[PDB]
Design goal:
The structure is a homodimer.
Chain A: H1 3-24, H2 35-45, E1 48-49, E2 58-59, E3 67-72, E4 78-79, H3 87-93, E5 98-104, E6 107-114, H4 120-132, E7 143-144, H5 145-151, E8 153-154
Parallel strand pairs in A: 3-5
Antiparallel strand pairs in A: 1-2, 4-7, 5-6, 6-8
The structure holds magnesium ion (2 copies).
Catalytic activity (chains A, B): Endonucleolytic cleavage of DNA to give specific double-stranded fragments with terminal 5'-phosphates
Keywords (chains A, B): DNA-binding, Endonuclease, Hydrolase, Magnesium, Metal-binding, Nuclease, Restriction system
EC number (chains A, B): 3.1.21.4
Chain lengths: 156, 156
């Protein structure tokens, strides 16, 4: 018997509880694909995760679907969007608001929401580009956190 | 009503405390690559995880390096090894004992240990096949959970 194993005995009851709660909200393994993270935003925002692959993310009770980006303010300063961006992708992203999650570690610090118009400045640009470069795709253009803090609504 | 959120806030301090525990043992994110699972193995077992290189996965305080393998008994039933198996990789293997972590969900279920002599059976079989196949790298052969249980010393 030692210090840590006592910490595992002590803490584990709650961890199993956190996982149970994660299953109810559709997340099998909190220790895998940032499940332990995606859940905070879900619980914090009353949203529901959509299966599929990597198209539309969450959806509320009203059925309004959402796009959902996450960032670790300790490591990055812009959100990923799509490594292969063309006018079809952009055509889809301009129909649903995006939920931006800002984590510092595994802990959530803030959450903003940009409406389709609030990202328009980026859509019309990434599109005018796709043409100029000669029908060439953009490799994961990034939206600056500064941009989202100044344009979106802070939900958390 | 805010049923589940209030719950999240209730469980989080222990989750955070659990994350701190993991960092001490060189795991930056519990919600990544089974961060919260490998920890159970490290605390119960007392092993230290070796960085990306150094081949072997863990070591103890005595300096004994080990090969650490894990599986979700819910999903798979045989531990993977190496996708490019060959006499050189096998040579790497014969040198150290293997720790076998059997997970059932986000929680360990049992932990076993094999001495090279115990995997001797599988190494020879592979080496021979690598050759009789005209020098071909065996694609990730596996070890049945039934074997490690019949032949290994249960540490947990
Ligand atoms: Mg998306
Ligand atoms: Mg290997």
């Amino acid at each position: 018997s030692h210090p840590d194993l006592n910490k595992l005995l002590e803490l584990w009851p709650h961890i199993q509880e956190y996982q149970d709660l994660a299953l109810k909200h559709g997340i099998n393994d909190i220790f895998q694909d940032n499940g332990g993270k995606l859940l905070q935003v879900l619980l914090i925002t009353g949203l529901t995760v959509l299966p599929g692959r990597e198209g539309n993310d969450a959806v509320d009770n009203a059925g309004q679907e959402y796009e959902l980006k996450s960032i670790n303010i300790d490591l990055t300063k812009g959100f990923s969007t799509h490594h292969h961006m063309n006018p079809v992708i952009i055509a889809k992203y301009r129909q649903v608001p995006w939920i931006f999650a800002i984590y510092r570690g595994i802990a959530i610090e803030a959450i903003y929401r940009l409406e389709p118009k609030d990202l328009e400045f980026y859509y019309d640009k990434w599109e005018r580009k796709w043409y100029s470069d000669g029908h060439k795709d953009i490799n994961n253009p990034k939206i600056p956190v500064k941009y989202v803090m100044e344009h979106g609504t802070k939900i958390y």
